[PDB]
Structures are given as C-alpha cells and as structure tokens.
Structure 1
Amino acid sequence: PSRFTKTRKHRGHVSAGKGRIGKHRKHPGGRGMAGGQHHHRINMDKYHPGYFGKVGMRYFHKQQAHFWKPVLNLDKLWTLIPEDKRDQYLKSASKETAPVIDTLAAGYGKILGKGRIPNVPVIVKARFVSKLAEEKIRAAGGVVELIA
C-alpha cells in the first residue's frame, strides 16, 4: 500500500515534509553510529550507556552447547507429566508408587525453586539441582536422582 502513505498527501506541497530552511540534504550527521563520542555523545551516554569500552575476558572458541542449562521451577514439574495421568497421581500417591519425571527428556538441565507444590511424592531425575528445589521435594516426600 502506497495509496495509504503520506507521500501522496504531499503532492502539491513543495518541501515534502522535510522542510524549507533546513532541508532533506544528503547525510548530515555522518553515516552511521558515527560521532559517538564527538557530536552524538549525549545520546550515546543517555540512551545507550555501556557502549565504548572493553569489559571482561575473552573466551576463544565458545561453543554454546557446553552452556546448555535450561531452567525449570517447581510449578511446571507437574506439567511435564501428561494431563491424563497427573489427575490420578495427584488425588492418588497416598499409595507407595511415585511418578518419575525425566527433565532431561523434557528438555531441561536444571530445576529451580520458584513456587510451591502439593504434598505428593515424586522422583525427579535431573543433572543439576538447586538447594531449595531439593528441600521442597524431600519435604513433599520425594527424592532427587542425579544423572549423567
């Protein structure tokens, strides 16, 4: 749609919305992120502060597969179970048998602590765990089985 743009409403009006005194000239201000510490300094120091400098040290050859630790909290743990069975694990589990949850197959590498859970024993298999998130599981009745 060009019939909806303001280039159409400016047919007739010389100085098509870019002015008469100061016009639409050809790159005034430099090309780019230029003048970042000369004449655009008090934008780059207001709206983008932290530009202009080195921090921290270099990691040559980062593979972002080592640093695969997706988090899960104790709220979605019962979403990992399929909706059809967590019904009969919630109201049940007054029995001895306990549902087992493989977070690594869910796609997660760590479990965390945010939130609460029912007093329902689980078994939680994960390669990394937080202290509070083990404390809550043991408190419910469960256990944590580190893997890998």
Structure 2
Amino acid sequence: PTRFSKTRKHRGHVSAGKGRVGKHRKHPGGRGMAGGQHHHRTNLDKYHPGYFGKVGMRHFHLLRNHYWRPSINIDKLWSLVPSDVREQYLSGQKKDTAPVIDLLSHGYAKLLGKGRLPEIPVVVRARYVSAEAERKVKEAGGVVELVA
C-alpha cells in the first residue's frame, strides 16, 4: 500500500529528504563488497571478524546421508508413548509390564541423557547411546539394546 508511506510526505520539499550537500549520487563507495580490505576495513573488523583467510581441510564429494543421526534427550523419552497409556504407567496401575520403545521408528538414532527419569523400568532400542544415558536408564531398572 503506497497511500501511506514517507514518499507521500516529501512532496513539496525539494531534495526529497536526501540532503542538500550530499545529493544521493549513484554509487559513491563502489558496488557490493568492494573495498573490503581498503576503505571498509573498519566495518569488516568491528563486525564479522573472521571474514578473510583460509582454515581447515577440504572434503571432495560430501554426501550428507552418511552423517544422519538425529538425537533425543532422556527427559523427553516418556513423551514417546501415547497419553492414555502414559498416564496408566505414571499413575501406577500396571506393576507387571514394561514398554519397549523403538527410537528408530519415531525418527531418532542416538539417545543422549540430560534430565532425570522416574523409577519405572523401560526398554530402549537405539543405534547409538551415551555413557551418562546408559547409567540412568540402567539404575531405573531397564536395559538398552543395539539394533542397527
């Protein structure tokens, strides 16, 4: 909508708000990132430190699929079972059954461990697992298998 924009309030004032001494010429300073090392160095060194230079080794023909392994913490593990079944377990009316959660189906590969866990035995099937995660799931009463 152009009916309310600052260009409609400039009609009648010569120079259209761009100044009388500096007249808004075409390209004073150069096009693009010109002068990066010469007259725009102050900007490129107060901000963006690290722009120039080379670092690290290179890698020909990277295939991103080789590096697919999304993770999941340990406090969100209980959010993988439906709500109605979940409340039955946490409220304490089963006492004799344990859920076998399969991370791979729900789209996870590694089970990291960050939070706490309630003292109910479970069974986890993962591709990768961390040292801290293993300890917590084991002291709760369950075990973790490797499935590939």
Superposition TM-score tier, normalisation by shorter sequence: over 0.9
Letter in 2 for 1:95: K
2 CA distance for matches of 1:54 and 1:115? 40
Identity %: 71
Corresponding residue of 2:111: 111
Mapping for residues 1-148 of structure 1, pairs under 5 Å: 1-92=1-92, 95-148=95-148
2 CA distance for matches of 1:102 and 1:31? 56
Change (3 A) 1:43 1:84: same
Q: Is the 8 A contact 2:88 2:94 kept in 1?
A: no
Number of residues paired by the alignment? Answer: 148
Question: What is the TM-score normalised by the length of structure 1?
Answer: 0.93
Shift of 1:121: 1.0
1 CA distance for matches of 2:116 and 2:123? 16
SS in 1 for 2:101: strand
Question: What is the TM-score normalised by the length of structure 2?
Answer: 0.93
SS in 2 for 1:145: strand
How big is the alpha-carbon RMSD for the aligned residues of Structure 1 and Structure 2?
1.5
1:53-98 Cα offsets, whole Å, 9 max, x none, are: 1111111111111111211101211111111211112233863421
Q: Which runs of 5+ in 2 are unaligned?
A: none
Shift of 1:142: 1.4
Letter in 1 for 2:101: I
1 CA distance for matches of 2:72 and 2:102? 12
SS in 2 for 1:27: coil
Letter in 2 for 1:38: H
Q: Is the 8 A contact 1:125 1:146 kept in 2?
A: yes
